[PDB]
């Protein structure tokens, strides 16, 4: 696992430095604000129906009662620009706060704890998560368990020995063509079937798919002592 | 999950077929350009929602030619190749129960088609359904691992506390309990149309907002007339610019009200889209040790079903 | 008829495409309207006929191009219309020019719509292909067949949230 | 004994009752 894990951390450091589009998630948030800030500032150059967009130009030309008519055109357009900005910022913040709740959730469940929920902490079975500080956000490094090599195995739901069905306490039944084995679901570790790894429930005439085999009993060889 | 993509042109909507009116619209600057970018971002996020929800895997999983369901009847949830479009018997009812747009899209607004067609969205569900029947719990977290479905319900009981010995003994009785549960859903959706109203409300919410924005063109907005050319004919060009300015300002408030709702309704859909992305992850792909997240009862395995502008979940519970 | 024109009928004016349909107005009703009270059809002041008014062709201009660092090739996309103005090809979203239709489907690159994605590939240009949903994987299934991992790989996935 | 584990004594836990726990090791020694 040392060669797998330590190389996986280096792949991310090589992916972030060489490829800059991986951070585009946060780059869009900064760009979404800049496009909202720039749009709000560019509105002061728009006349909004007024003769000019400069206050000093209107005040120096039209009468004070005449300027209030044109200044009314600017402020109405500038309020609609500012209210639209505040409207978006309240909506954009709701997007950020919703992601912050996921960031607060993953920080507890992925980073702090261990989440059994699949693909919440990312592809693979979650082990631990590593938080990293990022501008206007956070970057999570999730240690996951991904199975790689597999092989077709002969399985049975039950084992018939004395006339009663035997079921695995943990794991599943597999066979490599020689003897039936009890292995973990995520890892193949051939093990002799014994009464310690299985429990007796029902008989051989009920379960569909039960096969005949012999379960090792550790008490029998000790009878000679 | 997906909300109807609508791109409204503020050049045509504000000023219909008028260059001089468009000159008055240019006096307001980027307001037109900004409102277009807001509805464009919605159409992009709705396409991102379908990718972050409907497709949880990078491979297409299909059912083998020999179908062994372990006693259950999966013909309802699995697609039928005999139909011209690939969909399950349940999704066929989901398309019919969820249903003018042509007149409004000629008024200077555009309804954009989704990035993922219903046939492609159904293949995403077809890949998830065929996976859970074959690969089961493995394919969500990595490469697909073939497991017999008779054993795919054994560990799911071990996750909810039930010893898996109950499955193999009661598998014949569970075959009748599961198949009857699927049959009651088909009769519920076909006979009763209020079960899918959650999606119909989303379509009605958009159709009402679309109709609301279009009906505002007939309003006076304080102007003498609602027609740009009629004002130009009855009044002098300088006197018409005052009346036209009342229409433009009123029609911009119509867009600013529509765009505001769409941005808010999108966040409402994205809130449900993130749930659909989370539920498909926890419910469909894996097993949920949580209570009542996948619905009432101890969760076992979930069946996604493609639906117009959304998704339908079938949660097998204990 | 059947062209984009500026029409003035009696005291009514407008711009669109005139097409005679099977609709029948009441003899005392000259002008029709839609839900929005916008005229969808008229009756000629001279001859008696029912002419449906369809607005002139318009839509969005979608520019599909790779980044400035890649190439200057551009595929112009028109929305909800066939090819009118105008390697002129048609798609489901509308008239798409500048891109070449390819039967071979690859991974999606530039999103378009209706399950169509564009990319710059091979003497290279922009191609318009059907969006691929990923490699087809047929998993064998059997009562006694099972796949138990004999080896695993620890991969660190990077999730980025604001 | 395979379904149970020995922790503490009978004078602490409230609600403990007297019964006979089957021990599979006993019949194998005599037989
Ligand atoms: C399981 O897979 C891992 C790779 O994920 C194997 O590790 C490699 O083994 C080869 C053997 O020649 C080495 O050359 C590589 O350098 C190893 N890579 C890493 C990352 O360590 C491993 O041998 C496989 N077998 C087992 C039992 O784990
Ligand atoms: C399948 O598994 C069995 C049990 O582990 C293997 O049997 C062993 O094979 C090795 C190598 O030939 C022998 O040294 C052991 O003595 C065998 N053990 C027993 C008890 O048979 C078997 O080789 C594996 N492969 C096959 C062919 O099924
Ligand atoms: C497993 O063993 C059982 C017996 O314990 C087999 O069932 C017997 O089948 C024969 C016919 O082949 C009958 O005459 C016996 O009366 C049956 N005995 C019982 C207990 O019912 C069973 O067929 C064997 N299965 C396999 C696959 O070998
Ligand atoms: C699963 O249910 C379907 C329901 O269509 C069964 O298909 C048919 O069901 C009707 C009764 O509604 C029977 O009269 C037909 O003979 C069935 N077959 C066909 C080809 O229509 C189907 O048989 C059931 N079983 C499975 C495993 O699919
Ligand atoms: C057994 O393992 C193989 C490993 O590839 C699985 O894949 C099959 O491989 C055979 C090789 O001839 C192909 O003909 C099949 O089309 C492959 N199937 C798929 C869907 O990839 C195979 O599924 C496993 N099970 C069997 C039937 O042995
Ligand atoms: C699971 O077991 C069933 C029953 O043994 C298999 O179905 C048999 O397939 C064979 C070989 O083609 C036929 O001769 C039989 O008529 C089938 N019997 C039944 C009851 O259907 C099935 O093939 C096995 N698993 C899979 C998926 O192949
Ligand atoms: C179990 O039965 C005994 C009586 O046989 C109950 O009382 C115990 O009696 C013995 C003398 O026979 C005393 O030495 C003990 O101190 C008594 N108490 C206990 C708990 O040992 C005893 O209360 C019964 N326990 C239960 C929970 O049924
Ligand atoms: C008007 O004049 C035309 C000339 O062709 C004639 O055909 C029509 O009958 C007259 N009456 C109407 C209906 O306008
Ligand atoms: C364009 O991008 C490629 C790949 O990142 C890079 O190698 C090349 O130097 C870039 N060219 C320019 C002009 O930036
Ligand atoms: C486009 O062409 C198709 C197929 O001929 C036709 O059905 C459709 O009406 C055309 N649409 C337009 C906008 O011309
Ligand atoms: C696509 O298939 C059609 C119909 O067979 C054929 O006419 C055409 O040449 C093919 N085009 C490409 C790019 O392969």
Q: Which residues contact C70 (CB under 8 A, 6 or more apart)?
A: C120
Which chain B residue shows the shortest CA-CA distance from C59? Answer: B110
Q: Tell whether A185 is within 8 A of chain C (Cβ).
A: yes
Q: Tell whether D25 is within 8 A of chain A (Cβ).
A: yes
* Residue C120 structure tokens: 């710059």
| B and D touching (3 or more beta-carbon pairs closer than 8 Å) | no
CB-ligand 1 contact for A208 (6 Å cutoff): no
What are the percentages of helix, strand and coil residues in chain A, rounded to 5?
45, 20, 30
Task: Tell me the CA–centroid distance for residue C21 and ligand 8, in Å.
Answer: 21
Chains A & C: contacts with CB separation below 8 Å: 129
Q: How many Cβ atoms are within 10 Å of D24's Cβ, its own excluded?
A: 10
CB contact under 8 A, A136 and C150: no
Tell me the chain B residues in contact with residue C37 when contact means C-beta distances shorter than 8 Å: 218
Distance between start and end Cα atoms, chain D:
19
Q: Specify the ligand 3 atom closest to the Cα of A160.
A: 1
* Residue A196 structure tokens: 């310690």
Report the distance separating Cα B97 and Cα B188, nearest Å: 12
Tell me whether strands A165-168 and C110-113 are parallel, antiparallel or unpaired: unpaired
* Residue C101 structure tokens: 């239709």
Q: Chain A: give the shortest CA distance to residue C142, in Å.
A: 10
Chains A & B: contacts with CB separation below 8 Å: 125
The neighbours of chain C, by the rule of 3 or more Cβ pairs under 8 Å, are: A, B
Please name the method used to determine this structure.
cryo-EM
Tell me the chain D residues in contact with residue A223 when contact means C-beta distances shorter than 8 Å: 28
Buried b (16+ CB within 10 A) or exposed e, C16-44: bbbeeeeeeeeeeeeebebebebbbbbbe
CB contact under 8 A, A98 and B271: yes
Ligand nearest to the CA of A203: 3
Task: Tell me the CA–centroid distance for residue A178 and ligand 2, in Å.
Answer: 7
> If we measure between CA atoms, which residue out of B124, B170, B173, B67 comes closest to residue B276?
B124
What are the percentages of helix, strand and coil residues in chain C, rounded to 5?
0, 50, 50
Asked whether B309 and B2 are in contact (CB, 8 A), the reply is yes
Q: How many Cβ atoms are within 10 Å of A55's Cβ, its own excluded?
A: 15
CB contact under 8 A, A172 and C148: yes
Which CB contacts under 8 angstroms, 24+ apart, belong to C95-98?
C96/C64, C96/C128, C98/C64, C98/C73, C98/C74, C98/C126
Task: Tell me the CA–centroid distance for residue C161 and ligand 9, in Å.
Answer: 28
Tell me the chain A residues in contact with residue B164 when contact means C-beta distances shorter than 8 Å: 167
CB contact under 8 A, B64 and C140: yes
Q: Chain C: give the shortest CA distance to residue B193, in Å.
A: 27
> If we measure between CA atoms, which residue out of B116, B92, B293, A207 comes closest to residue C132?
B116
Q: Chain B: give the shortest CA distance to residue A208, in Å.
A: 7
Residues 141-200 in A contacting B (C-alpha not used; CB under 8 Å): 144-148, 150, 152, 155, 157-158, 165, 167, 172, 185, 199
> If we measure between CA atoms, which residue out of A137, A121, A115 comes closest to residue A26?
A137
Report the distance separating Cα C8 and Cα A163, nearest Å: 96
CB contact under 8 A, A207 and B145: no
DSSP state of C131: P
Q: Specify the ligand 2 atom closest to the Cα of A177.
A: 28
Task: Identify the residue whose tokens are 């066929």.
Answer: B92
Ligand nearest to the CA of A213: 3
Ligand 7 mutation pick, D10, D11, D16, max ligand atoms within 8 A of CB: D10
Q: Which residues contact C92 (CB under 8 A, 6 or more apart)?
A: B113, C113, C114, C115, C116
Report the distance separating Cα B25 and Cα C132, nearest Å: 43
CB contact under 8 A, A8 and C150: no
Ligand nearest to the CA of A205: 3
Report the distance separating Cα B133 and Cα B302, nearest Å: 11
Tell me the chain C residues in contact with residue A185 when contact means C-beta distances shorter than 8 Å: 148
Ligand 10 mutation pick, C60, C82, C88, max ligand atoms within 8 A of CB: C82
Q: Specify the ligand 3 atom closest to the Cα of A211.
A: 27
Tell me whether strands C125-130 and C99-102 are parallel, antiparallel or unpaired: parallel
Buried b (16+ CB within 10 A) or exposed e, A130-155: eeeeeeebbbbbbbbbbbeebeebbb
The side-by-side arrangement of strands in the sheet containing A211-212 is A198-200, A165-168, A159-160, A211-212
Report the distance separating Cα C10 and Cα C34, nearest Å: 19
Asked whether B93 and B186 are in contact (CB, 8 A), the reply is yes
Ligand 2 mutation pick, A151, A176, A213, max ligand atoms within 8 A of CB: A176
Q: Tell whether C86 is within 8 A of chain A (Cβ).
A: no
> If we measure between CA atoms, which residue out of C64, C54, B139 comes closest to residue A119?
B139
CB contact under 8 A, B171 and A117: no
CB-ligand 2 contact for A185 (6 Å cutoff): no
Q: Specify the ligand 4 atom closest to the Cα of B89.
A: 5
* Resolution as reported, in Å: 3.8
Q: Alpha-carbon torsion C8, C11, C17, C20, what sign?
A: negative
CB-ligand 3 contact for A212 (6 Å cutoff): yes
Report the distance separating Cα C23 and Cα C16, nearest Å: 18
Q: Tell whether B170 is within 8 A of chain A (Cβ).
A: no
Tell me whether strands C95-97 and C99-102 are parallel, antiparallel or unpaired: unpaired
Using a 6 Å CB cutoff, which residues line ligand 7?
Answer: D 10-11, 16-18
Q: Which helix (H) or strand (E) holds B314?
A: strand B310-317
Q: Specify the ligand 4 atom closest to the Cα of B67.
A: 27
Q: How many Cβ atoms are within 10 Å of A62's Cβ, its own excluded?
A: 16
CB-ligand 11 contact for C104 (6 Å cutoff): no
CB-ligand 6 contact for C138 (6 Å cutoff): no
Which chain A residue shows the shortest CA-CA distance from D2? Answer: A196
Q: Chain B: give the shortest CA distance to residue C15, in Å.
A: 8
The CA distances from residue C40 to B106, C10, C19, C30, in Å, are 11, 16, 10, 12
Atom 5 of ligand 11: nearest residue by CA position: C103
Q: Tell whether A131 is within 8 A of chain C (Cβ).
A: no
Tell me the chain A residues in contact with residue C141 when contact means C-beta distances shorter than 8 Å: none
Q: Is B310 left (phi over 0), alpha (psi -120 to 50) or beta?
A: left
Report the distance separating Cα B117 and Cα B47, nearest Å: 11
Task: Identify the residue whose tokens are 């003769």.
Answer: A51
Tell me the chain A residues in contact with residue C154 when contact means C-beta distances shorter than 8 Å: 1, 4-5, 8, 127, 143-146
Q: Chain C: give the shortest CA distance to residue A66, in Å.
A: 37
Q: Is A122 left (phi over 0), alpha (psi -120 to 50) or beta?
A: left
């Amino acid at each position: 696992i040392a060669n797998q894990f330590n190389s996986a951390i280096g792949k991310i450091q090589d992916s972030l430095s060489s490829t800059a589009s991986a951070l585009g998630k946060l780059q869009d948030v900064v760009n979404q604000n800049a496009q909202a800030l720039n749009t709000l500032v560019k509105q002061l150059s728009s006349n909004f129906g007024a003769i000019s967009s400069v206050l000093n130009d209107i005040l120096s030309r039209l009468d004070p009662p005449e300027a209030e008519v044109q200044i009314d055109r600017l402020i109405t357009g500038r309020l609609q620009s500012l209210q639209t900005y505040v409207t978006q910022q309240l909506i954009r913040a709701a997007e950020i706060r919703a992601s912050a709740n996921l960031a607060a959730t993953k920080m507890s469940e992925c980073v702090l704890g261990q989440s059994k929920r699949v693909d919440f902490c990312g592809k693979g079975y979650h082990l631990m998560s590593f938080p990293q500080s990022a501008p206007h956000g956070v970057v999570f490094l999730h240690v996951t368990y991904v199975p790689a090599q597999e092989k077709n195995f002969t399985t049975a739901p039950a084992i018939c020995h004395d006339g009663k069905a035997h079921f695995p306490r943990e794991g599943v039944f597999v066979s490599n063509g020689t003897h039936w084995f009890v292995t973990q679901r995520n890892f193949y570790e051939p093990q002799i079937i014994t009464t310690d790894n299985t429990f007796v429930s029902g008989n051989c005439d009920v379960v569909i798919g039960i096969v005949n085999n012999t379960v090792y009993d550790p008490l029998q060889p000790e009878l000679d002592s | 999950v997906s909300m109807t993509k609508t791109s409204v042109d503020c050049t045509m909507y504000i000023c219909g077929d008028s260059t001089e009116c468009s000159n008055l619209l240019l006096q307001y600057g980027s307001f037109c350009t900004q409102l277009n970018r807001a509805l464009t971002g919605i159409a992009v996020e709705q396409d991102k929602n379908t990718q972050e929800v409907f497709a949880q895997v990078k491979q297409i999983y299909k059912t083998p030619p020999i179908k062994d369901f372990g006693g259950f009847n999966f013909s309802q949830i699995l697609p039928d190749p005999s139909k011209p479009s690939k969909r399950s018997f349940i999704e066929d009812l989901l398309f019919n129960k969820v249903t003018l747009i042509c007149a409004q899209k000629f008024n200077g607004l555009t309804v954009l088609p989704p990035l993922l067609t219903d046939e492609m969205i159904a293949q995403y569900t077809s890949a998830l359904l065929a996976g859970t029947i074959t690969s089961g719990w493995t394919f969500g977290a990595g490469a697909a691992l073939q497991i017999p479905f008779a054993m795919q319900m054994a560990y799911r009981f071990n996750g909810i506390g039930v010893t898996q010995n109950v499955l193999y003994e009661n598998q014949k009785l569970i075959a009748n309990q599961f198949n009857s549960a699927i049959g009651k859903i088909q009769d519920s959706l076909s006979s009763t149309a209020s079960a899918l109203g959650k999606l119909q409300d989303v379509v009605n919410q958009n159709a009402q907002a679309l109709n609301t924005l279009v009906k505002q063109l007939s309003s006076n907005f304080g102007a003498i007339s609602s027609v740009l050319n009629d004002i130009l004919s009855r009044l002098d060009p300088p006197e018409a610019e005052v009346q036209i300015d009342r229409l433009i300002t009123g029609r911009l408030q119509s867009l600013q009200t529509y765009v505001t709702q769409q941005l808010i309704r999108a966040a409402e859909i994205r809130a449900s889209a993130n749930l659909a992305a989370t539920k498909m992850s926890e419910c469909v792909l894996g097993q949920s040790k949580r209570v009542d997240f996948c619905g009432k009862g101890y969760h076992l395995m979930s069946f996604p079903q493609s639906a117009p502008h959304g998704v339908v979940f079938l949660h097998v519970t204990y | 008829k059947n062209k984009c024109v500026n029409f003035n009928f009696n005291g009514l004016t407008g711009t669109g495409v005139l097409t005679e349909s099977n609709k029948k107005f009441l003899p005392f009703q000259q002008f029709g309207r839609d839900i929005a009270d916008t005229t969808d059809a008229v009756r000629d002041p001279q001859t008696l006929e029912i002419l449906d008014i369809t607005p002139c062709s318009f839509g969005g201009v979608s520019v599909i191009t790779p980044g400035t660092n890649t190439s200057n090739q551009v595929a112009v996309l028109y929305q909800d219309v066939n090819c009118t103005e105008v390697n002129v090809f048609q798609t489901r979203a509308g008239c798409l020019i500048g891109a070449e239709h390819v039967n071979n489907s690859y991974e999606c690159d530039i999103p378009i719509g209706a399950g169509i994605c564009a990319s710059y590939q091979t003497s290279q240009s922009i191609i318009a292909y059907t969006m691929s949903l990923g490699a087809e994987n047929s998993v064998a299934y059997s009562n006694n067949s099972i796949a138990i991992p004999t080896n695993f790989t620890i991969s660190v996935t990077t999730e980025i949230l604001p």
